[PDB]
Amino acid sequence: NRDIQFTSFNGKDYPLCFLDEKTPLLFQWFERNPARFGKNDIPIINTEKNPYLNNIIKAATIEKERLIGIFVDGDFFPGQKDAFSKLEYDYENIKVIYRNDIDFSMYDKKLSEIYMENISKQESMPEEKRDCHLLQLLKKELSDIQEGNDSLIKSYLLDKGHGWADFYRNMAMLKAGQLFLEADKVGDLSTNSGCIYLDADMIITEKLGGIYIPDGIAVHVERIDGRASMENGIIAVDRNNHPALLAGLEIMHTKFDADPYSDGVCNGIRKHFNYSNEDYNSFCDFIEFKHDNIIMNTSQ
């Protein structure tokens, strides 16, 4: 509304920006084994203990005035893409966005460039503090680089773990509201380009309402027995190319084998706020996404 509000971390004040009740939601489904689903089924796991499509449909049915993205990748059968088109037709606020249809080149770097800056960073490293093996592996990987394969973004399309989904999610979230604009799925703003990423296990039990996040970014924090950690389930951004995620992308461009979750999000947010030596815990209550309307499918 009319007046900007502030919060303090480490004695510095920071602007709270306001994600209105129209801010889009983004879910993600990157599927290794489309063959597990019926040939004309929605290819998202939907079982009583894992009701992920139901969670997404619930969010869409609760937040009628929000766009609901499903950012998808994997070799889907053509009748599963047909199922996805039917979902968009059934629920007019659900918008399916294929990774394949989005250009991520503006966030790319040559593997050769990352490898060689790391070599130079080590080889020039004052003493033998050098990781002998990292130096050795870097020089060999620099050698086995195919012509149209010198891409940090293409490399994550061959990632064998969580890195395939988490790297692309970070870049989807660098695009934020502009993701819907890029996919021609808007029915938005040149300013109001915020977005809230939610993991498909999160359940909106009722209407989110307006949300205040600090300096335009907030993350899932989990607490177990009084210890807090930042988590990848919830990322809320004030706009596209939010500086914290660019900080995270900068680490992904410099640190060889950087983790897209702990470097691409956590470390990036950390650098943006210049944290480090203070309490992780006090930082975690600061950066935490406040909702109270998003439980997981493991609660009573």
Numbering used by the authors: 23 to 209, 212 to 300, 302 to 325
Provide the authors' own sentences about this structure as they appear in the paper.
Escherichia coli NleB1, Citrobacter rodentium NleB, and Salmonella enterica SseK1/3 type III effectors fatally glycosyltransfer N-acetyl glucosamine (GlcNAc) from UDP-GlcNAc to arginine residues of death domain-containing proteins that regulate host inflammation, intra-bacterial proteins, and themselves, whose post-translational modification disrupts host immune functions and prolongs bacterial viability inside host cells. All NleB/SseK orthologs have a typical GT-A conformation with two abutting β/α/β Rossmann domains unlike a GT-B consisting of facing each other β/α/β Rossmann domains with a flexible linkage and share a high degree of structural similarity. Several structural cores were revealed for the new arginine N-glycosylation systems: a catalytic DxD motif to position the Mn2+ cofactor and UDP-GlcNAc donor substrate, His-Glu-Asn (HEN) motif to select UDP-GlcNAc as a suitable donor substrate before other sugar donors such as UDP-Glc/Gal, C-terminal loop to stably embrace the UDP-GlcNAc donor substrate, and Helix-Loop-Helix (HLH) domain predicted to select the acceptor targets. The SseK1 effector GlcNAcylates Arg9, Arg190, Arg160, and Arg149 of four proteins involved in methylglyoxal detoxification, namely, GloA, GloB, GloC, and YajL, respectively, and catalyze methylglyoxal detoxification to significantly enhance their activity.
In all apo- and UDP-bound NleB1/SseK1/SseK3 effectors, the DxD motifs lie in the 219YLDADM224/221YLDADM226/224YLDADM229 regions and their quaternary DADM motifs form a Type-I-turn by H-bonding between the backbone CO(i) and NH(i + 3) groups, while the free Asp oxygen (Oδ of Asp221/Asp223/Asp/226) in the DxD motif interacts with the hydroxyl oxygen (Oη of Tyr219/Tyr221/Tyr224), named as a YD bond. In particular, apo NleB1/SseK1/SseK3 effectors have the free oxygen Oδ of the first catalytic aspartate in the DxD motif, ready to catch Mn2+ and UDP-GlcNAc. All N-glycosylated NleB/SseKs form a Type-I-turn in the DxD motif in the ligand-bound state, and the pathogenic NleB1/SseK1/3 toxins also retain Type-I-turn in the DxD motif in the apo state. Apo Clostridium toxin TcnA and apo E. coli NleB2 have twice intertwined Asx-β-turns, where Type-I-turns H-bond between the backbone CO of D284/D218 and the backbone NH of F287/M221, and the Asx-turn C10 H-bonds between the side chain of D284/D218 and NH of D286/D220 in apo TcnA/NleB2. These results indicate that the first catalytic aspartate in Apo TcdA/B, TcsL, SseK1/3, and NleB1 DxD motifs is open to bind Mn2+, whereas those of Apo TcnA, SseK2, and NleB2 are tightly tied by the second aspartate backbone in the Asx-turn of the DxD motif and are unable to bind Mn2+ and their ligand.
